[PDB]
Amino acid sequence: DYASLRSLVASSGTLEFKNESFNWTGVKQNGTSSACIRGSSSSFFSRLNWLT
Amino acid sequence: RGQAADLKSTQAAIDQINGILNRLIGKTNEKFHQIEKEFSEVEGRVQDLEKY
Ligand SMILES: *[C@@H]1O[C@H](CO)[C@@H](O)[C@H](O)[C@H]1NC(C)=O
Ligand SMILES: *[C@@H]1O[C@H](CO)[C@@H](O)[C@H](O)[C@H]1NC(C)=O
C-alpha cells in the first residue's frame, strides 16, 4: 500500500531516525547487493538490515 | 402637540418578518447513520478521504 505510507510520511514532516540496538543473535547482518553501489563498492539500503 | 402610531404598516412589516422567521426556524432534516468523523489512529488514504 504505497499511497498510505507516502501520505503518512508526508504528513509526519520529518525523517529523523534514532538507532536502536536489536539483539539479532546467530545470523549475519548487513549484507550487500550489486544493484546498490555506494561509491565504488556494493551496498544496500541504509535504514534496513538484510539478515542472512 | 401629539403623537400616534399607524397599525396597518406595523402589522404588514411584522407579518412579513414573521413569515421569514417561520420559513427559517423549525425546519430540520433527519440524518441517522453517517461516517466516522473522529479517529484515534492513522491508517492512510481512506481516512484522508473521509476527512476531506
Ligand atoms: C541477546 O541474546 C543473548 C543470547 O545469548 C542473551 O544472552 C542476551 O541477554 C540478549 N540480549 C538482550 C539485550 O536481550
Ligand atoms: C553492520 O555494519 C554496521 C555499519 O558498518 C556495523 O556497525 C555493524 O556492527 C555491522 N554488523 C555486523 C558486523 O554484524
Side-chain angles (χ1 to χ4, degrees):
Chain A
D1 200 32
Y2 182 89
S4 306
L5 184 52
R6 207 185 88 127
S7 309
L8 172 144
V9 182
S11 319
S12 65
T14 169
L15 271 173
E16 204 185 319
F17 206 64
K18 176 61 183 334
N19 284 5
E20 316 228 48
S21 209
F22 293 89
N23 217 14
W24 294 137
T25 201
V27 282
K28 159 181 317 162
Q29 303 187 300
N30 285 295
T32 57
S33 62
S34 146
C36 315
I37 307 202
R38 208 165 305 244
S40 57
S41 304
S42 60
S43 190
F44 202 64
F45 289 115
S46 65
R47 311 257 163 241
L48 267 64
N49 198 1
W50 186 354
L51 267 59
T52 279
Chain B
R1 284 201 231 101
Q3 184 170 289
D6 195 15
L7 307 181
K8 273 194 237 187
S9 72
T10 300
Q11 200 65 35
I14 283 173
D15 286 347
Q16 288 181 3
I17 291 174
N18 279 345
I20 285 172
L21 255 64
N22 159 275
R23 208 123 60 98
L24 275 178
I25 278 277
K27 325 261 155 293
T28 305
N29 292 157
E30 288 185 349
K31 308 257 154 254
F32 292 121
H33 195 207
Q34 301 158 291
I35 62 171
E36 254 67 61
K37 326 223 176 67
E38 270 184 3
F39 312 100
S40 53
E41 335 163 330
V42 308
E43 55 212 6
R45 97 198 276 209
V46 188
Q47 167 175 343
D48 272 338
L49 186 57
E50 296 173 339
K51 287 201 232 183
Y52 193 70

